[PDB]
Design a protein around this nucleic acid. Structure first.
Ligand SMILES: [Zn+2]
Lengths: 77, 60, 113, 176, 80
RNA sequence: UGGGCUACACACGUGCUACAAUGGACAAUACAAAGGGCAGCGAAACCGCGAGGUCAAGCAAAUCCCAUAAAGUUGUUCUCAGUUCGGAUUGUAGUCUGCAACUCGACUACAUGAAGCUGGAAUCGCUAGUAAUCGUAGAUCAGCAUGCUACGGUGAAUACGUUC
C-alpha cells in the first residue's frame, strides 16, 4: 500500500458482551481499553452489544437482554 | 336529541365511566342539573310554569 | 471551582452552588447539609476543607457533562425508536401534548409571519 | 486471518469433497471485494460525496477511488467526468478481515435482520450484497453521519457456478 | 394502569395472541386495535399491525420500544 | 373498535403568569363572607420530602367534614444583578381517577431555566366599598377550569366642563 494516504489500521478484539465472546480482526476503531490475547501480544478491545453468536437469526435461540437495559428495568418495576 | 342516542344513554353501559346524564324531559346532553335531571331550558320552562317545588326567580 | 465549573465568589454558597448544571436549590441545600457548611457563608470566605468536602459530595451526583450526555441520549433514543415524542423532537414542536394552533413559541422559535 | 485459516483448513476440504475436484487448484476462493457507493446527489452537493468517501474509508481501511460519470445524462443533470461515486477494492488479509467483520459484527446490526438474499448471484459465481445503512458497520458513529446511505459489496470469487459460490459463502458463514 | 401498584396495562386478548405461537420461530403479524396496550419484553421481535384510525400501520418491536404504548408508533394525524 | 373535534408556515378577540426591592426567599403569628356533602364531606393517627396511601371517628347538617383563607403583621437574608426575578420548554422518577391518561387528564419530586427589565400605531373597563389587588366556594363533573357563576379581606384617584 501507499504511504500516508490510508487511515490508521491496527488489530482489535471485537468482544460481544452478551456472550463474552472475543474475535480478533483488523479495524480502525482504536478503543482505549486493552486486553490480552492467546498470542503474547495485547490488542485493544471493541465492545459489541450483538454479534454472530448472539443474534437470534444466527444462533437459532432467543437473545438475552443485557443488564441495566429497558427489559431489565421494566421487570424491576 | 336523537331517539337512538337517548335509548343508548338509557341502556346499560359495558363501561361504568361510560355513563353520562341527559335531560329526562327533552334529551339535551349539555347543561343538565343533577338535582332535577333537567337541562337549563326545561328548568326555566318548568320554573315559569311553577311545577318545580320551591323554585322561583332569585334576586339580591 | 467545583465539578470543573467556577461559581460566583461573592454569592452565598447555597445559591452559588446552583450555578453548577444539575444542581438546583434543593440539591444545593442537601449537599450543604451533608457536607456541613454554614448556609450564609460566602464562597470567598470559605475553608479548603469545606471546599473539599463539598467536592466529595458533589462528584457522586452525576451532574454537568454526564447529565447532559444522559439527557441527549434519552432524546436520541426516543427519536431513533420513531416514537411520537421522537417525531415531535425532530420537528421542534411541543412534546407533552400542547396545542400548536397558538402559543407554541418556546418550541417553534420566533414568529414567521 | 481467522477466516483465511478457516478457508484453508475446513472450507477447502468440505468444498473439495462436495464437488469432487481432481486438483486443489480447482477449489474456489474469494478473489476480491469491491465496496461501491453511488452518490448521484453529489451533482447538487459535493459535500455529500465527501462525507460518503470519509465513511467508506473508515469502513474499509483504505482510501477510496472516486468514480466519475462515464457519460453525460441530461435527466440526471450529470456531466461527463463529475465524481458521482466511491469504490474500494479489498484483496488478501484486508479482504478477509472485512468479510469476517461484515459477517459477524456488521450484518446482525440490521434492524429486523432475516438473512441476506440467496439469489443475489450474477450467474457466474459472484455475489452482490446491497446494504441499506452505513450505520450497520461498527466503525461509524451515528452522531457524525450527516446522511444515511447504502453500499454495494461485490464479492468476486473464482467459482464457475452459483452453486459453488453459495457453498463457499455458506462455509464462510453467510446467512441466507 | 400507570400507577406502579397496578401492573402495566395490556389487553388480555393482545397478550394471549402474542403468547400463542411463541415457540414457533415463524412468528406472523398480529392485527390489533389496542393503541393503549403497553409493550412488554415478551413483544420484542414481533410485528403488530396497529390500527391508527383508517389502516393498520406495521410496527416492529425492538428492545428500546419496551415500556411504551403500541400507539406511539402509529401516528394518527397527517401533516405535510 | 379506533381516530377527528386537541392539527399548525400564520392573523385576530378574551384571559393567566411575569418583567421585580411598594419585591423574592425562609420561619413565626392573626382577621372573613358565601356555598357543598349519601355511598358523598373523609377529622385524628401512622407511612412518604411530596402529590398521596392504610386504618378510620363524626356527619343526611347552625352539631361533623370539606376548611389552617391569602393579601397583612413581626424577625433573618438577598442588594438592583436576565439575578435567590421570571417558570415556558424538555429529561427522568411518581401519585390519583378511570377497564383504559400514546394521540389526549390533573397534580407531585429532582434537574433543565426560554422570552420577558413595563410594551409602536392604536385601544378597553371603571364615578365608591366602585376601580385595583388578595384569596374563598359552587354548577358541570370518575378525572379534568387561567372559563363561568357567587363570597368576602384591604381599598384608591378624579369628574373643571360639553369645544371635540
Ligand atoms: Zn331539557
Amino acid at each position: 500500500m501507499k504511504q500516508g494516504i490510508h487511515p490508521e489500521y491496527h488489530q482489535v478484539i471485537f468482544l460481544d458482551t452478551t456472550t463474552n465472546f472475543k474475535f480478533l480482526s483488523g479495524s480502525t476503531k482504536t478503543s482505549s481499553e486493552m486486553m490480552e490475547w492467546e498470542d503474547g501480544k495485547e490488542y485493544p478491545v471493541i465492545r459489541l452489544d450483538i454479534s454472530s453468536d448472539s443474534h437470534p437469526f444466527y444462533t437459532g435461540r432467543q437473545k438475552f437482554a443485557a443488564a441495566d437495559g429497558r427489559v431489565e428495568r421494566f421487570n424491576k418495576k | 336529541a336523537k331517539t337512538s342516542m337517548v335509548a343508548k344513554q338509557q341502556k346499560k353501559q359495558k363501561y361504568a365511566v361510560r355513563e353520562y346524564t341527559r335531560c329526562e324531559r327533552c334529551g339535551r346532553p349539555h347543561s343538565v342539573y343533577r338535582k332535577f335531571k333537567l337541562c337549563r331550558i326545561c328548568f326555566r320552562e318548568l320554573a315559569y310554569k311553577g311545577q318545580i317545588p320551591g323554585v322561583r326567580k332569585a334576586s339580591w | 471551582r467545583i465539578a470543573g465549573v467556577d461559581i460566583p465568589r461573592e454569592k452565598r454558597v447555597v445559591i452559588s452552588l446552583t450555578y453548577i448544571y444539575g444542581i438546583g436549590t434543593s440539591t444545593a441545600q442537601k449537599i450543604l447539609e451533608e457536607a456541613n457548611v454554614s448556609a450564609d457563608t460566602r464562597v470567598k470566605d470559605l475553608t479548603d476543607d469545606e471546599l473539599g468536602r463539598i467536592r466529595e459530595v458533589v462528584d457522586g451526583y452525576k451532574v454537568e457533562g454526564d447529565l447532559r450526555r444522559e439527557t441527549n441520549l434519552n432524546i436520541k433514543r426516543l427519536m431513533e425508536i420513531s416514537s411520537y415524542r421522537g417525531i415531535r423532537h425532530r420537528r421542534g414542536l411541543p412534546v407533552r401534548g400542547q396545542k400548536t394552533k397558538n402559543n407554541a413559541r418556546t418550541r417553534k422559535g420566533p414568529v414567521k409571519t | 486471518n481467522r477466516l483465511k485459516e478457516k478457508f484453508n483448513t475446513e472450507v477447502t476440504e468440505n468444498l473439495m469433497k462436495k464437488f469432487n475436484y481432481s486438483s486443489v487448484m480447482e477449489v474456489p476462493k474469494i478473489d476480491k471485494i469491491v465496496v461501491n457507493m453511488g452518490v448521484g446527489d453529489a451533482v447538487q452537493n459535493s459535500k455529500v460525496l465527501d462525507n460518503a468517501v470519509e465513511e467508506l474509508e473508515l469502513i474499509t481501511g483504505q482510501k477510496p477511488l472516486v468514480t466519475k460519470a462515464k457519460k453525460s445524462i441530461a435527466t440526471f443533470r450529470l456531466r461527463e467526468g463529475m465524481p458521482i461515486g466511491a469504490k474500494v477494492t479489498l484483496r488478501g488479509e484486508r479482504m478477509y478481515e472485512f468479510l469476517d467483520k461484515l459477517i459477524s459484527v456488521s450484518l446482525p446490526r440490521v434492524r429486523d435482520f432475516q438473512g441476506v438474499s440467496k439469489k443475489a448471484f450474477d450467474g457466474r459465481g459472484n455475489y452482490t450484497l446491497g446494504v441499506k445503512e452505513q450505520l450497520i458497520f461498527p466503525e461509524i458513529d451515528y452522531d457524525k453521519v450527516s446522511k444515511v446511505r447504502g453500499m454495494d459489496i461485490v464479492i468476486v470469487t473464482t467459482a464457475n457456478t452459483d452453486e459453488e459460490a453459495r457453498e463457499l459463502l455458506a462455509n464462510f458463514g453467510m446467512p441466507f | 394502569a400507570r400507577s406502579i401498584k397496578k401492573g402495566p396495562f395490556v389487553d388480555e386478548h393482545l397478550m394471549k395472541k402474542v403468547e400463542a405461537q411463541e415457540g414457533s420461530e415463524k412468528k406472523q403479524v398480529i392485527k390489533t386495535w389496542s393503541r393503549r396496550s403497553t409493550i412488554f419484553p415478551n413483544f420484542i421481535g414481533h410485528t403488530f399491525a396497529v390500527y391508527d384510525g383508517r389502516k393498520h400501520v406495521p410496527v416492529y418491536v425492538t428492545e428500546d420500544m419496551v415500556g411504551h404504548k403500541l400507539g406511539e408508533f402509529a401516528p394518527t394525524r397527517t401533516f405535510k
